[PDB]
Amino acid sequence: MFKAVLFDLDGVITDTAEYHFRAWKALAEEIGINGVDRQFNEQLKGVSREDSLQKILDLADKKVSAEEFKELAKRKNDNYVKMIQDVSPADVYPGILQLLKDLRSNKIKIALASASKNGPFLLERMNLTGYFDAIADPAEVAASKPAPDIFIAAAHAVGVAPSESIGLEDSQAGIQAIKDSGALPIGVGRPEDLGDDIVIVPDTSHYTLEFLKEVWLQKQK
Numbered sequence: 001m002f003k004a005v006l007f008d009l010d011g012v013i014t015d016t017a018e019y020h021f022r023a024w025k026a027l028a029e030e031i032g033i034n035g036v037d038r039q040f041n042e043q044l045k046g047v048s049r050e051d052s053l054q055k056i057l058d059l060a061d062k063k064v065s066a067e068e069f070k071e072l073a074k075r076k077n078d079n080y081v082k083m084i085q086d087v088s089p090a091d092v093y094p095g096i097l098q099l100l101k102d103l104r105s106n107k108i109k110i111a112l113a114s115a116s117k118n119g120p121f122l123l124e125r126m127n128l129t130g131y132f133d134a135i136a137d138p139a140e141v142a143a144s145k146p147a148p149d150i151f152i153a154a155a156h157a158v159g160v161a162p163s164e165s166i167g168l169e170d171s172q173a174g175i176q177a178i179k180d181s182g183a184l185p186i187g188v189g190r191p192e193d194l195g196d197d198i199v200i201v202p203d204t205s206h207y208t209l210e211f212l213k214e215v216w217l218q219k220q221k
């Protein structure tokens with residue numbers, strides 16, 4: 001039986017991409033760049049802060065200095081911090097709170113496996129701090145997803161080996177990170193984006209303790 005569940009933040013617990021979008025839209029409007037709409041936000045999914053800023057500058061074929069590029073990326077981060085003050089328990093994805101309650105009552109460890117520098121603050125905004133046993137130590141993460149580092153760190157933070165854990169993710173890079181950590185991946189999303197080899201669920205409402213137990217026992221063959 002598994003002893004821990006390692007949670008990714010964006011796309012599993014909540015939608016932080018929406019707040020990243022509002023941050024980028026605020027920056028674009030300030031510097032006078034049109035086109036940062038909902039359809040453009042899809043080109044920013046799973047893309048780094050630097051490459052995302054470049055895509056926004058590309059919308060106006062705008063060239064900036066290395067110093068101004070750094071300043072704009074900083075200004076976006078400041079915008080993001082202001083945007084996330086609005087995160088509330090209403091932001092929690094369906095089924096996640098009940099899963100957290102069920103894991104805690106069954107003495108199964110809960111860890112946050114996120115590359116977010118605002119992870120604990122977001123859990124606090126969502127009233128989820130009491131369910132989390134530990135957050136992955138950023139000092140033990142040398143490389144990001146697809147590298148297994150973050151999931152290995154999350155498992156270790158709750159006192160378990162990755163092999164005794166289940167990892168929940170919405171991205172292909174994150175699924176690969178769980179696989180290489182030794183933990184069992186259960187993905188969330190469309191089969192067109194994630195692939196056949198692992199167990200995938202359409203949405204987070206399917207992430208029940210009953211289902212996690214079933215999948216775990218099935219993969220012990």
Ligand SMILES: [Mg+2]
Nearest residue numbers: 008010011170
């Ligand atoms: Mg994610």
